[PDB]
Design an enzyme around this catalytic site. Structure first.
Site, mmCIF file in Angstrom:
data_model
loop_
_atom_site.group_PDB
_atom_site.id
_atom_site.type_symbol
_atom_site.label_atom_id
_atom_site.label_comp_id
_atom_site.label_asym_id
_atom_site.label_seq_id
_atom_site.Cartn_x
_atom_site.Cartn_y
_atom_site.Cartn_z
ATOM 1 N N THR A 1 -0.379 -2.779 3.986
ATOM 2 C CA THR A 1 -0.714 -3.222 5.614
ATOM 3 C C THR A 1 -2.254 -2.855 6.014
ATOM 4 O O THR A 1 -2.982 -2.520 5.345
ATOM 5 C CB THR A 1 -0.120 -2.081 6.437
ATOM 6 O OG1 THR A 1 1.421 -1.893 6.153
ATOM 7 C CG2 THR A 1 -0.137 -2.203 7.939
ATOM 8 N N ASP B 1 -1.195 -6.551 10.982
ATOM 9 C CA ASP B 1 -0.506 -7.752 10.236
ATOM 10 C C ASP B 1 0.914 -7.712 10.404
ATOM 11 O O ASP B 1 1.460 -6.820 10.967
ATOM 12 C CB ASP B 1 -1.244 -7.799 8.867
ATOM 13 C CG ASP B 1 -0.752 -6.806 8.133
ATOM 14 O OD1 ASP B 1 -0.608 -5.937 8.153
ATOM 15 O OD2 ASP B 1 -0.161 -7.235 6.793
ATOM 16 N N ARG C 1 2.983 -8.322 7.024
ATOM 17 C CA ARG C 1 3.255 -8.261 5.709
ATOM 18 C C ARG C 1 4.260 -6.930 5.101
ATOM 19 O O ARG C 1 3.634 -6.067 5.797
ATOM 20 C CB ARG C 1 2.394 -8.374 4.578
ATOM 21 C CG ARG C 1 2.804 -8.692 3.270
ATOM 22 C CD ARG C 1 1.766 -8.961 2.202
ATOM 23 N NE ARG C 1 1.581 -10.566 2.519
ATOM 24 C CZ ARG C 1 0.571 -11.235 1.743
ATOM 25 N NH1 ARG C 1 -0.142 -10.457 0.871
ATOM 26 N NH2 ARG C 1 0.347 -12.320 1.848
ATOM 27 N N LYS D 1 4.980 -4.248 12.961
ATOM 28 C CA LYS D 1 4.515 -2.747 12.796
ATOM 29 C C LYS D 1 4.175 -2.129 14.275
ATOM 30 O O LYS D 1 3.531 -1.242 14.031
ATOM 31 C CB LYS D 1 3.329 -3.071 11.846
ATOM 32 C CG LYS D 1 3.714 -4.005 10.538
ATOM 33 C CD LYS D 1 2.544 -3.650 9.458
ATOM 34 C CE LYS D 1 2.697 -4.714 8.296
ATOM 35 N NZ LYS D 1 1.935 -4.657 7.096
ATOM 36 N N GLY E 1 2.003 2.772 5.617
ATOM 37 C CA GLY E 1 2.318 3.455 4.799
ATOM 38 C C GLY E 1 3.951 3.230 4.501
ATOM 39 O O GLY E 1 4.283 1.967 4.191
ATOM 40 N N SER F 1 -3.859 -0.365 3.646
ATOM 41 C CA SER F 1 -4.641 -0.791 2.609
ATOM 42 C C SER F 1 -5.737 -1.852 2.573
ATOM 43 O O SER F 1 -6.787 -1.691 1.939
ATOM 44 C CB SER F 1 -3.441 -1.704 1.477
ATOM 45 O OG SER F 1 -2.973 -2.657 2.260
ATOM 46 N N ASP G 1 -7.246 -8.549 1.648
ATOM 47 C CA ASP G 1 -6.578 -7.653 1.173
ATOM 48 C C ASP G 1 -5.095 -8.200 0.787
ATOM 49 O O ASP G 1 -4.340 -8.852 1.522
ATOM 50 C CB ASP G 1 -6.148 -6.501 2.226
ATOM 51 C CG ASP G 1 -5.478 -5.304 1.391
ATOM 52 O OD1 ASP G 1 -5.622 -5.122 0.432
ATOM 53 O OD2 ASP G 1 -4.651 -4.817 2.345
ATOM 54 N N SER H 1 -1.915 -7.166 2.474
ATOM 55 C CA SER H 1 -1.732 -7.664 4.055
ATOM 56 C C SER H 1 -1.749 -9.089 4.194
ATOM 57 O O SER H 1 -2.251 -9.884 3.235
ATOM 58 C CB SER H 1 -3.024 -7.177 4.827
ATOM 59 O OG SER H 1 -3.105 -5.780 4.629
HETATM 60 C C1 LIG Z 1 1.030 -2.433 3.735
HETATM 61 C C2 LIG Z 1 1.608 -3.777 3.625
HETATM 62 C C3 LIG Z 1 1.076 -1.692 2.389
HETATM 63 O O1 LIG Z 1 1.181 -2.855 1.237
HETATM 64 C C4 LIG Z 1 1.682 -1.506 5.106
HETATM 65 O O2 LIG Z 1 1.170 -0.248 4.628
HETATM 66 C C5 LIG Z 1 3.303 -1.625 4.946
HETATM 67 C C6 LIG Z 1 3.757 -0.676 6.072
HETATM 68 C C7 LIG Z 1 4.447 -1.519 6.994
HETATM 69 C C8 LIG Z 1 5.716 -2.235 6.029
HETATM 70 C C9 LIG Z 1 5.310 -0.438 7.866
HETATM 71 N N1 LIG Z 1 3.775 -0.848 3.789
HETATM 72 C C10 LIG Z 1 4.887 -1.236 3.109
HETATM 73 O O3 LIG Z 1 5.329 -2.465 3.301
HETATM 74 C C11 LIG Z 1 5.351 -0.274 2.156
HETATM 75 C C12 LIG Z 1 4.530 -0.149 0.868
HETATM 76 C C13 LIG Z 1 4.955 0.935 0.320
HETATM 77 C C14 LIG Z 1 5.843 0.732 -0.791
HETATM 78 C C15 LIG Z 1 6.299 2.005 -1.297
HETATM 79 C C16 LIG Z 1 5.884 3.328 -0.904
HETATM 80 C C17 LIG Z 1 4.936 3.427 0.012
HETATM 81 C C18 LIG Z 1 4.691 2.180 0.731
HETATM 82 N N2 LIG Z 1 6.676 -1.091 1.662
HETATM 83 C C19 LIG Z 1 7.929 -0.279 2.015
HETATM 84 O O4 LIG Z 1 7.876 0.867 2.419
HETATM 85 C C20 LIG Z 1 9.163 -0.999 1.641
HETATM 86 C C21 LIG Z 1 9.893 -1.267 2.749
HETATM 87 C C22 LIG Z 1 10.911 -2.634 2.349
HETATM 88 C C23 LIG Z 1 10.181 -3.734 1.670
HETATM 89 C C24 LIG Z 1 11.954 -2.907 3.337
HETATM 90 N N3 LIG Z 1 10.115 -0.008 0.724
HETATM 91 C C25 LIG Z 1 9.715 0.193 -0.485
HETATM 92 O O5 LIG Z 1 9.122 -0.510 -1.259
HETATM 93 C C26 LIG Z 1 10.743 1.305 -1.130
HETATM 94 C C27 LIG Z 1 10.057 2.450 -1.004
HETATM 95 C C28 LIG Z 1 10.832 3.434 -0.520
HETATM 96 C C29 LIG Z 1 10.361 4.862 -0.953
HETATM 97 C C30 LIG Z 1 11.106 5.937 -1.116
HETATM 98 C C31 LIG Z 1 10.430 7.002 -1.458
HETATM 99 C C32 LIG Z 1 9.466 7.410 -0.931
HETATM 100 C C33 LIG Z 1 8.292 6.385 -0.698
HETATM 101 C C34 LIG Z 1 8.798 4.934 -0.233
HETATM 102 N N4 LIG Z 1 10.972 1.010 -2.391
HETATM 103 C C35 LIG Z 1 11.936 0.398 -2.753
HETATM 104 O O6 LIG Z 1 13.140 0.223 -2.423
HETATM 105 C C36 LIG Z 1 11.999 -0.071 -4.471
HETATM 106 N N5 LIG Z 1 13.319 0.176 -5.021
HETATM 107 C C37 LIG Z 1 14.326 -0.874 -4.926
HETATM 108 C C38 LIG Z 1 15.574 -0.809 -5.836
HETATM 109 O O7 LIG Z 1 16.046 0.435 -5.383
HETATM 110 C C39 LIG Z 1 15.256 1.405 -5.757
HETATM 111 C C40 LIG Z 1 13.966 1.312 -4.882
#
Ligand SMILES: *[C@@](C)(CO)[C@](*)(O)[C@H](CC(C)C)NC(=O)[C@H](Cc1ccccc1)NC(=O)[C@H](CC(C)C)NC(=O)[C@H](CCc1ccccc1)NC(=O)CN1CCOCC1
Ligand SMILES: *[C@@](C)(CO)[C@](*)(O)[C@H](CC(C)C)NC(=O)[C@H](Cc1ccccc1)NC(=O)[C@H](CC(C)C)NC(=O)[C@H](CCc1ccccc1)NC(=O)CN1CCOCC1
Ligand SMILES: *[C@@](C)(CO)[C@](*)(O)[C@H](CC(C)C)NC(=O)[C@H](Cc1ccccc1)NC(=O)[C@H](CC(C)C)NC(=O)[C@H](CCc1ccccc1)NC(=O)CN1CCOCC1
Ligand SMILES: [Cl-]
Ligand SMILES: [Mg+2]
Ligand SMILES: [Mg+2]
Ligand SMILES: [Mg+2]
EC number: 3.4.25.1
Lengths: 195, 222, 222, 233, 125, 196, 204, 212, 195
Positions: free
Chosen positions: C1, C17, C19, C33, C47, C129, C166, C169
């Protein structure tokens, strides 16, 4: 590779070696001969790490056969066992040691006596009336302590050996697919086909 | 502790036609979440109508391409300027890769060109040298996104003839260079949408008996 | 993000953003967001996606009940305090990184909260990020006494820096403007500079392409 | 296997219409300790190339000696050493890139990130990056360390693609570089105010600027910031 | 290491060291080989200027290389031991890798190859 | 962080830099590490930003509740509450706090509370990563019963050096003056203090 | 020992013109060993459809849980739950187990009975809602499905055309994944009729 | 991978699948896991793709050099031992190879040797090697007789791979058949599992677990 | 604990379970019955961690028997299998989970149909025509894929089962000391004494 036994009786040495070759959850073979003839009156059974066992056995076999040709003479079982021990004693301090345990059954023609030697992968040699490698010993040694007599015949030795195999087949966790039995005496080496 | 490998991202794609072959690859170079370059070419003309790309860890990729280019040069010197056939090049590359079996080039290699019958050829390699000729191959970061699409559109997998009760398969046929470039561009725009390491630009190298032509297309820069 | 917040003359503006990632894969190309805690207190979240959504709704719910209890419009410091104490209690395991902003009877406010429960005050802030890409723009172009239109421009420019530079994002720019004495205006998809280009080909299949084994009507009624 | 001890931070650079600009601060950090303040991290090779180096300073000094020795070796039995057969930026870069990759392949890397900026004999701008892993890439703007995260975004607003290079003057390009250095001083905890800047132009040649300082900084707004949330005093 | 090229060509195209080695063979006691329909026989001369010999322990002229191949010779006795040893080792090495004893042609080819190597190696005769 | 508190003739002065870091990134270059727990009892915060804030918030609550029942608390009392939190939760806290306050009876007082949760009453106190570089300087230059202007110069010169050598310290130099006259906030920018 | 990829499986959902489609494979295995080729991953509560990939025990548990909760919902509310409301219920329920989560990738699909609008949504294992106009993917071949859907999909497809697109997206994605396949089911959902089709695919 | 080869009345049957995986990613469905060493020698490959391929391609060069030097085709025993002695030198280095050297010679007759990367070398009548070996064993052992016809033996080998291709997630693609006689090896076609499964299901009446 | 199989045929469910109980290098028992009767027409075989298996089996047995007394009615195999699944589904997120895999063979008297359920320790339930737990499946599934037909008789099912045991005895590394076979049909549960 798992079960190798040896019993020295009055006039012969009897080696029994399991036929199973397992890898993972599959018995790949059930007719494997875990032994090599080093010389006409000397036989070596072996067990241990895959690949190492046969590589080591054949390497020893080649060396002993080379000696026989050079001198036109058969080495004594004692001499062969000392050679084998030294090779393993070198091996253990190598970059990659041979993980192979062996039994050397032989008939000394000069002494007119059967001889059984037990050598582990570390190069630990012992002459014994009966021997075993691996978990087999934990059952067979106590059994032989009870039933073994030094003046037994070859036929009595085979019955004594049947008693060991039966106990192993009863209490061992793994299926080792029976044993190939070989006899070493004054007339050389021969295989018991029906066991 | 020092880690000698890195991931420079990106993705590549090879498709073979009847009398041609294409080798495409995006021009984005990355480390972690940063963009290093929006235009850093990784598909190279290596001579003798062979195009090559070694996607993955760029340093190893550049080293490999550099070494194969040099292998082609010495093949001419040692064998009276003979043309290195695509099948011979592939085997030579296997030995380059497997030569470092115990400290590998971290790359997915693809080469493209024409076989000795004049027909389109694409070969693909794993990091340690196992290779295979195919009509179709995607490699790199977005290979998992692109490859099943190619199976469906190039090799007509899971496609049956309408009204035949799923009994007669859709018949295989070669694609025109125009149809192939459409599939390449659609593959990369799709990959750009859903994979963060793919974007910026697309560079396609087309190989016919006439020579090696290039085409460039913009991709999304986010 | 990438998320930002910028203070101006008669209020505060926040932006983000759109994404959402799942490893290197873009899961959502247009996720929201910007969250509403109360009518005139809004929150930008970075996060762990579930955590930012969950923690903002919980505090938003308790703020509503508090506002009804006290017969007063809620304050940003109340949302700030409730969030930081909740996040601190969970020792960073709730991975919510928030930019909290809004207007209340005390005035206009702009704060940031981190997962471990630390808060910061500022005229311009950025999290996520792509916060470094955004903060570079903010440090270069921010000044005291910004107007409404200048703050929106600066904020969206800071998000754009994240979008382009980034890999974490991308896609669109959401904005929310909170001016004193006025209703807060939530500008969903304020900018959309990443529109997908027309595909080269339609992949609409001839009817009957897919082989079928069985058919049946499903009963959804009682 | 190494660990870096005395380190140098960001090196930033970009292309403009007639040449290239490169810059790097004069700090030699020892972890969090800002140990050495008179360190030059831009090293000219001839009158047409500048090598900017970040990372381990001991390894930087080793690279200095290699480049110094490269000039000597090129002059041997070379009547055109100051003319047609002079060292090019591309020659200097490829040499370093060869060394960097050979050292990583022996698991004993030079712990650096290097940017070779210069102008070729035919007038073309040269700007390429190489690091401890032997990874190489080129771009209109290049930066190392924190520069990659903060400078590049700012420099790419000026030169976003190839076609923007002829449109960018040396005045505009230098202004962006000097601005980027200020931002890095605000935000990079292992940076210093003092820095060096080098311009390699195809017309005016090599201009090496020493003892520059970050200036026109915004700090006044800090007085208004009180506490971390509630506090009014 | 001693490097000298001892076996070399002469103006008339002869390698004298190889030809002088043949003279040593001509000096040696006679050896004969005759092969029948189902057998081979190796005959060997033993000079009778040596009485008071112990024929039990004196090295025999015919040597077994393996259980199925034999080697007799004429020339320098000490030299023959080196060839026989090498041949015996190669015989066991062949059984080890090919899982089959050497052919007579193969064993001959090996021994002949050893002899050739000593005609264009430095430091050796 | 670089923080310090110094007693003098008229009372006590707290001093601090304004840098907050995540690794080598400066998350906040205008941080306020001097925080009010009571009218004329303040503290300098070093260590974890989350922990020190959480602690300071609790102490402020305790001293507000103390004031409602028993009237104005002493500076010693405030330091005791800080200690109680830091000591009893030593396993879960990273907080180096300097407590400074002005009584009319006791005048200026300074208590320092390191990681362990121990309390140490001193004439002056220094703390934070950047304090290591100024032990030598502060010991040689500190005098008791300094004037306001002398104490301000002492803190300014001290933190200037701490900032110069410590990468984890920088930005502006904030100060808070605690005397019978009241509470005065001071700020000093890079262009002034760097060239001292 | 990665819960999400022990049993294997995939789910995909798409929107069309006044219709939605949801599809899943039939494989249930224990790592390399294929165990069942009848394990359906799509369930429905009234007119709302839920697909669930991931750890099979949790797939079963959550189905039983959402059947439980929607049944009580209907008794108290005196009406069937809608997709938008159900989506929130799934999110709530998953986040309730934030620090001990169900290892699943659920996918809601359906048509709002009041407004007539097609609706699809996806979730991560801790309940983060991923709403989408076009399509939602889930499972061990999610990368493959993303690639297929992003290229093959186009808006406003008719039910009969939408069937072909989603079916080809699932089939070709499944064939590039070792833990997915072994049969497939496709639900075509219109306002007041639902057609369920079993696809013929390669059985390896 | 799944590969097998068994000995019978009419020579040797050799059957393999064609899948290649990188974890759960199905990388290829058209890999050639039978290496044609010469008109009388075949080699099966299972394990690390590059290791198997590179070294069995190398084995063919060593077998060619043998017949140039010895004016005679190499024995199956000698060929297998070249490979087993090679991999034994690399023991511990991490080579991953599960191979079977199948062929005919005058002195040996039809012969099969199992050779793997930890140095095991075994002569035998039946072997199944690979991730899906157990699935192949189940069908092969329960239907195997020495007196099988060439037609029935070819089918059993094909059916055994199909069985493994079905159950084993890391096996599939297509079945490659070979038949080794006194006159040399004979190729018996590539059989895609996509069509073969349904063809076998319908005609044989098996695979009742699957939805027809 | 190792080998448990299950085959559902036309009119019955057949469960085969190995008799060996091994610990270390000793087969402690070769006549162990790895099953409990949950109700007159429902049988559960089990395999897994020592102690857990029997403790779990008897706990389930007690609960089902309690239900039967309370309602004076026999639960359907489907109902029992759902109850068992839920218990294992709870267990897996406990402080110490039951490491037990089970097969539930039953005859539904209301439907007049045999039913076989396979449930692992995670609480993963599947209804199958034939099932197995542990390494057994790696041999038996492919074998049954080939030889199984849905309309088979009980006698045909026993021959089909003999074919599985023979294959396991041939290719399995461990000696599992044969199997106890039990049949579940309309007339209840009975044991085949000669197998
Ligand atoms: C930018 C885009 C960071 O890249 C932003 O910070 C965004 C925040 C917005 C969306 C509010 N962050 C994310 O998109 C975030 C990045 C991330 C990933 C993992 C850990 C922390 C941050 N993505 C997510 O949270 C996604 C949301 C989905 C796409 C709807 N979720 C996951 O990636 C989950 C993580 C869940 C989790 C559990 C325990 C601790 C921390 C996070 N991951 C999965 O579902 C992966 N996997 C799929 C198959 O089943 C097993 C889990
Ligand atoms: C000087 C700077 C050092 O002593 C001062 O003491 C200041 C005190 C002020 C702020 C009151 N200290 C800091 O700035 C402090 C330094 C620090 C860091 C980590 C542990 C203890 C002290 N910085 C922080 O507390 C920051 C503030 C945030 C960024 C607003 N927090 C972090 O760096 C967090 C801390 C996480 C944490 C660990 C252990 C105990 C409590 C909190 N760290 C991260 O987010 C890690 N980050 C993850 C991504 O990769 C980069 C590192
Ligand atoms: C069955 C299918 C499985 O056992 C067979 O045994 C086949 C044998 C055929 C191909 C001859 N085996 C494989 O498919 C084999 C499985 C395997 C993988 C890795 C180690 C041992 C065994 N697969 C491979 O060898 C693949 C083949 C490629 C995909 C065509 N290769 C890799 O996985 C390579 C090389 C692995 C490797 C070995 C030794 C040193 C270094 C690397 N690895 C990658 O491509 C890495 N990865 C691919 C996904 O993208 C990210 C990078
Ligand atoms: Cl703070
Ligand atoms: Mg500093
Ligand atoms: Mg599949
Ligand atoms: Mg399969």
């Amino acid at each position: 590779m798992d079960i190798i036994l040896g019993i020295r009786v009055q006039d012969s040495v009897i080696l029994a070696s399991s036929k199973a070759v397992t890898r993972g959850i599959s018995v790949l073979k059930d007719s494997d001969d875990k032994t090599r003839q080093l010389s006409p009156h000397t036989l070596m059974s072996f067990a241990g790490e895959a690949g190492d066992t046969v590589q080591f056995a054949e390497y020893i076999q080649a060396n002993i056969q080379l000696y026989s040709i050079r001198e036109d003479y058969e080495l004594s079982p004692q001499a062969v066992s000392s050679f084998v021990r030294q090779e393993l004693a070198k091996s253990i301090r190598s970059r990659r040691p041979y993980q192979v345990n062996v039994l050397i059954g032989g008939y000394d023609k000069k002494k007119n006596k059967p001889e059984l030697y037990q050598i582990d992968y570390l190069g630990t040699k012992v002459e014994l009336p009966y021997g075993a490698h691996g978990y087999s010993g934990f059952y067979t040694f106590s059994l032989l302590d009870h039933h073994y007599r030094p003046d037994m015949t070859t036929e009595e030795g085979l019955d004594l050996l049947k008693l060991c195999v039966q106990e192993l087949e009863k209490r061992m966790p793994m299926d080792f697919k029976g044993v190939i039995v070989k006899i070493v005496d004054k007339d050389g080496i021969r295989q018991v086909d029906d066991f | 502790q020092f880690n000698p490998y890195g991931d420079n991202g990106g993705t590549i794609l090879g498709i073979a036609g009847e009398d041609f072959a294409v080798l495409a690859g995006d021009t984005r170079n990355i480390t972690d979440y940063s963009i290093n370059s929006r235009y850093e070419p990784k598909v190279f003309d290596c001579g003798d109508n062979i195009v090559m790309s070694a996607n993955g860890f760029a340093a190893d990729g550049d080293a490999l391409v550099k070494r194969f280019k040099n292998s082609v040069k010495w093949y001419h010197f040692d064998h009276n300027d003979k043309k290195l056939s695509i099948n011979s090049a592939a085997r030579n590359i296997q030995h380059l890769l497997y030569g470092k079996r115990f400290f590998p080039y971290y790359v997915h290699t693809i080469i493209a060109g024409l076989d000795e019958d004049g027909k389109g050829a694409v070969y693909s390699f794993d990091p340690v040298g196992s290779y295979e000729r195919e009509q179709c191959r995607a490699g790199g970061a977005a290979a998992s996104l692109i490859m099943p699409f190619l199976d469906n559109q190039v090799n007509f997998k899971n496609q049956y003839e309408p009204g035949t009760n799923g009994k007669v398969k859709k018949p295989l046929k070669y694609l025109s260079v125009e149809e192939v470039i459409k599939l390449v561009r659609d593959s990369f725009t799709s990959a750009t949408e859903r994979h963060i390491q793919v974007g910026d630009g697309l560079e396609i190298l087309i190989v016919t008996k006439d020579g090696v032509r290039k085409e460039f297309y913009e991709l999304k820069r986010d | 993000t990438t998320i930002v917040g910028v203070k101006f003359n008669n209020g505060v503006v926040i932006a983000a953003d759109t994404r959402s990632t799942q490893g290197p894969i873009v899961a959502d190309k247009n996720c929201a967001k910007l969250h509403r805690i109360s009518p005139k207190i809004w929150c930008a979240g970075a996060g762990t996606a579930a955590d930012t959504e969950a923690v903002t709704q919980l505090i938003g719910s308790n703020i509503e009940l508090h506002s009804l209890y006290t017969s007063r419009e809620p304050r940003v410091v109340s949302a700030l305090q409730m969030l930081k104490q909740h996040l601190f209690k969970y020792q960073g395991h709730i991975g919510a990184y928030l930019i909290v902003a809004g207007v209340d009877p005390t005035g206009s406010h702009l704060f940031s909260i981190h997962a471990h429960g630390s808060t910061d005050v500022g005229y311009y802030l950025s999290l996520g990020s792509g916060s470094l890409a955004a903060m570079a723009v903010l440090e270069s172009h921010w000044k005291q006494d910004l107007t409404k239109e200048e703050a929106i421009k600066l904020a969206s420019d800071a998000i754009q820096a994240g979008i382009w530079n980034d890999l974490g994002s991308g896609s669109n720019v959401d904005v929310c403007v909170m001016e004193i004495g006025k209703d807060a205006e939530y500008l969903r998809n304020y900018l959309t500079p990443n529109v997908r280009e027309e595909k080269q080909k339609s992949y609409k299949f001839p009817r009957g392409t897919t082989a079928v084994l069985k058919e049946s009507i499903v009963n959804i009624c009682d | 296997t190494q660990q870096p001890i005395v380190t140098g931070t960001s090196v930033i650079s970009m292309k403009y219409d007639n040449g290239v600009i490169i810059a790097a601060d004069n700090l030699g950090s020892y972890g969090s300790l800002l140990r050495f303040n008179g360190v030059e991290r831009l090293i000219p090779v001839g009158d047409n190339t500048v090598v900017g180096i970040s990372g381990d300073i001991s390894d930087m000094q080793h690279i200095e000696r290699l480049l110094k020795d490269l000039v000597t070796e090129n002059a041997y039995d070379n009547p055109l050493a100051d003319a047609e057969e002079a060292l090019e930026p591309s020659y200097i870069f490829e040499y370093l890139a060869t060394v960097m990759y050979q050292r990583r392949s022996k698991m004993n890397p030079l712990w650096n990130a290097i940017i070779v900026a210069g102008v070729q004999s035919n007038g073309d701008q040269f700007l390429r990056y190489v690091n401890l892993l032997g990874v190489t890439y080129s771009s209109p703007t290049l930066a190392t360390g924190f520069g990659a995260h903060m400078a590049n975004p700012l420099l790419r607003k000026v030169v976003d693609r190839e076609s923007d290079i002829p449109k960018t003057t040396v005045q505009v390009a230098e202004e962006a570089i000097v601005n980027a250095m200020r931002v890095l001083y605000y935000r990079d905890a292992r940076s210093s105010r003092n820095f060096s800047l080098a311009i390699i132009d195809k017309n005016t040649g090599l201009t090496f600027k020493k003892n520059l300082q970050v200036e026109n900084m915004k700090w006044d707004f800090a007085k208004d910031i009180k506490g971390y949330g509630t506090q009014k005093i | 290491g001693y490097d000298r090229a001892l076996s070399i060509f002469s103006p008339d195209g002869h390698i004298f060291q190889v030809e002088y080695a043949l003279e040593a063979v001509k000096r040696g006691t006679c050896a004969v080989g005759v092969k029948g329909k189902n057998c081979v026989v190796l005959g060997c001369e033993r000079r009778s200027t040596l009485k008071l010999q112990d024929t039990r322990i004196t090295p025999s002229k015919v040597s077994k290389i393996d259980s199925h191949v034999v080697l007799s010779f004429s020339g320098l006795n000490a030299d023959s031991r080196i060839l026989i040893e090498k041949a015996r080792v190669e015989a066991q090495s062949h059984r080890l890798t090919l899982e089959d004893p050497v052919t007579v042609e193969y064993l001959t080819r090996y021994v002949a190859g050893v002899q050739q190597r000593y005609t264009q190696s430095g430091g050796v005769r | 962080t670089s923080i310090m508190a110094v007693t003098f003739k008229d009372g006590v002065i707290l001093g601090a830099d304004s840098r907050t870091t995540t690794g080598a990134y400066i998350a906040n270059r205008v941080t306020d590490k001097l925080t009010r727990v009571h009218d004329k009892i303040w503290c300098c915060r070093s260590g974890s930003a989350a922990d020190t804030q959480a602690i300071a918030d609790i102490v402020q609550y305790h001293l507000e509740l103390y004031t409602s029942q028993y009237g104005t608390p002493s500076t010693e009392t405030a330091a005791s509450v800080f200690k109680e939190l830091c000591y009893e939760n030593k396993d879960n806290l990273t907080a180096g706090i300097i407590v400074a306050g002005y009584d009319d009876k006791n005048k200026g007082e300074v208590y320092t509370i390191p990681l362990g949760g121990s309390v140490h009453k001193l004439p002056y106190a220094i703390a934070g990563s950047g304090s290591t570089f100024i032990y030598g300087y502060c010991d040689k230059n500190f005098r008791e019963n300094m004037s306001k202007e002398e104490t301000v110069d002492f803190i300014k010169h001290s933190l200037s050096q701490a900032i110069k050598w410590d990468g984890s310290s920088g930005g502006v130099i904030r100060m808070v003056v605690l005397t019978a006259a009241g509470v005065e906030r001071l700020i000093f920018y890079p262009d002034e203090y760097e060239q001292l | 020992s990665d819960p999400s990829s022990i049993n294997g499986g995939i789910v995909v959902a798409m929107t069309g013109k006044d219709c939605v489609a949801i599809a899943c494979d039939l494989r249930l295995g224990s790592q390399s060993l294929g165990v069942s080729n009848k394990f359906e991953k799509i369930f429905h509560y009234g007119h709302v459809f839920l697909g669930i990939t991931g750890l099979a025990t949790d797939v079963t548990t959550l189905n039983e849980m959402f059947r439980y909760k929607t049944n009580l919902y209907k008794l108290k509310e005196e009406r069937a739950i809608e997709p938008e409301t159900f989506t929130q219920l799934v999110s709530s329920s998953l986040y309730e187990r934030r620090f001990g989560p169900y290892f699943v990738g659920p996918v809601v699909a359906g048509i709002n009975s009041k407004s007539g609008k097609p609706f699809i949504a996806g979730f991560d294992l801790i309940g983060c809602i991923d709403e989408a106009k076009d399509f939602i993917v889930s499972g061990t071949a999610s990368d493959q499905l993303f690639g297929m859907c992003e290229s093959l999909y186009e808006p406003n497809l008719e039910p009969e055309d939408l069937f072909e697109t989603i079916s080809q997206a699932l089939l070709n994605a499944a064939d590039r994944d070792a833990l997915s396949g072994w049969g497939a089911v496709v639900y075509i959902i219109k306002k007041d009729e639902v057609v369920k089709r079993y696809l013929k695919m390669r059985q390896d | 991978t799944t590969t097998l080869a068994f000995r019978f009345q009419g020579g040797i049957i050799v059957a393999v699948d064609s899948r290649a995986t990188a974890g759960n990613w199905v990388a290829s469905q058209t890999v050639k896991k039978v290496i044609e060493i010469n008109p009388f020698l075949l080699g099966t490959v299972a394990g690390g793709a590059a290791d198997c391929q590179f070294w069995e391609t190398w084995l063919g060069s060593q077998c060619r050099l043998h017949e140039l030097r010895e004016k005679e085709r190499i024995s199956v025993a000698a060929a297998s031992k070249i490979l087993s002695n090679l991999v034994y030198q690399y023991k511990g280095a991490g080579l991953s190879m599960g191979t079977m050297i199948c062929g005919y010679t005058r002195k040996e007759g039809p012969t099969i040797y199992y050779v793997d990367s930890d140095g095991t070398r075994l002569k035998g009548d039946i072997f199944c090697v690979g991730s899906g070996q157990t699935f192949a064993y189940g069908v092969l052992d329960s239907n195997y007789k020495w007196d099988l016809s060439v037609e029935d033996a070819l089918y059993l080998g094909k059916r055994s791979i199909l069985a493994a291709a079905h159950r084993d997630a890391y096996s599939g693609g297509s079945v490659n058949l070979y038949h080794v006689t006194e006159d040399g090896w004979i190729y018996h076609g590539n059989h895609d599992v996509g069509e073969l499964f349904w063809k076998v299901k319908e005609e044989e009446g098996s695979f009742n677990n699957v939805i027809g």
